[PDB]
Design a protein around this nucleic acid. Structure first.
Ligand SMILES: [Cl-]
Ligand SMILES: [Cl-]
Ligand SMILES: [Mg+2]
Ligand SMILES: [Mg+2]
Ligand code: NA
Ligand code: NA
Length: 326
DNA sequence: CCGACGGCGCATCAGC
DNA sequence: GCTGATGCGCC
DNA sequence: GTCGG
């Protein structure tokens, strides 16, 4: 991590803009810059050197010069001292509490973990579970544990219907040694872009994982996306494992490649790739890649038989999952 | 200079 | 009840 | 905040 001090600064600025300022484009700008700097293979010597990178402009260059010179950023020193900003930044660390809710809570005098813990009745379902597992959700998952979780999910899904295919995506599929959570892409031949021949496809699977005490809580649930909590079983006399976040996304089987591209990420990689697509005259989502017609309206879905096909359309050399950790 | 910035699932709520 | 906006979440 | 037209 050659430029860890700089990327940390930019990430903190991004979080400020997202959580406090509520300026989503500034948030995205800062994260793009941190990402491009993170992959830069030299220790950065000045703002000008950084400004050569795409996504780093005049203002970030200036902040880099201050940070190189002094080891800190005055702007951030002040933000750190601001009680309201500090409170809002903290509250948003609870899953289900965003920029808006955090500011509203602070207005009501709810601004610490203790405050939250005595005001559960002021939380919606999602927020109440986020609070319940506040500490657990901040811990990362060792790949060894991700492997254990993979085995449970794949084996239980098979028990439900041998025709399901479950694929673990996210940072796991990018080969990370630790993951923030578990992301599972699910397919079944009864659910395609052309028909849904079986109901409760996602439900059946969730139910089974709850039955074996793997899924412990639900944050939200619809026909195609589950967002919840899970936990590895522990042995006799063993401390319990932390509770972990799990997302399950059922994708039309014939749209698996666009699905797995999306769910493999990273998020910044997806943003960069989708933006490049738009520049090349295509639009990409988790289902399809379509051309943009002269007007500006998406056209019909193009044939895709591999992840690589998607890269080809937009004239990118193929990038293995492990090289998409932007 | 200024329009655009990725795309979409689920929960909540206002207006009808 | 529905629909459209908004908040918050996924990558 | 940065980029491209
Ligand atoms: Cl700092
Ligand atoms: Cl589509
Ligand atoms: Mg993940
Ligand atoms: Mg996730
Ligand atoms: Na630049
Ligand atoms: Na949050």
């Amino acid at each position: 991590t050659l430029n860890g001090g700089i990327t940390d600064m930019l990430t903190e600025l991004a979080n400020f803009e997202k959580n406090v300022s509520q300026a989503i484009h500034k948030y995205n700008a800062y994260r793009k810059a941190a990402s491009v700097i993170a992959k830069y293979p030299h220790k950065i010597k000045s703002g000008a050197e950084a400004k050569k990178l795409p996504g780093v402009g005049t203002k970030i260059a200036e902040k880099i010069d201050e940070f190189l010179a002094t080891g800190k950023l005055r702007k951030l020193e002040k933000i750190r001292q601001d009680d309201t900003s500090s409170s809002i930044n903290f509250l948003t660390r609870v899953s289900g509490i965003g920029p808006s809710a955090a500011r509203k809570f602070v207005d009501e005098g709810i601004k610490t973990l203790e405050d939250l813990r005595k005001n559960e009745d002021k939380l919606n379902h999602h927020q109440r579970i986020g609070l319940k597992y506040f500490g657990d959700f901040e811990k990362r998952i060792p790949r060894e544990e991700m492997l254990q979780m993979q085995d449970i999910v794949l084996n239980e899904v098979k028990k439900v219907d041998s025709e399901y295919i479950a694929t673990v995506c996210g940072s796991f599929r990018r080969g990370a040694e630790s993951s923030g959570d578990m992301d599972v892409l699910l397919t079944h031949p009864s659910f395609t872009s052309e028909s849904t021949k079986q109901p409760k496809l996602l439900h059946q699977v969730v139910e089974q994982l709850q039955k074996v005490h793997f899924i412990t809580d639900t944050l939200s649930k619809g026909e195609t996306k589950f967002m919840g909590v899970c936990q590895l079983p522990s042995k006799n006399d063993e401390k319990e494992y932390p509770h972990r976040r799990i997302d399950i996304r059922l994708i039309p089987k014939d749209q698996y490649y666009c699905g797995v591209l999306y769910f493999t990420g990273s998020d910044i990689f997806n943003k960069n790739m989708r933006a490049h697509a738009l520049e090349k005259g295509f639009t990409i989502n988790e289902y399809t890649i379509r051309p943009l017609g002269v007007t500006g309206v998406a056209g019909e879905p193009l044939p895709v038989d591999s992840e690589k096909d998607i890269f080809d359309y937009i004239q990118w050399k193929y990038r293995e999952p492990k090289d998409r950790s932007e």
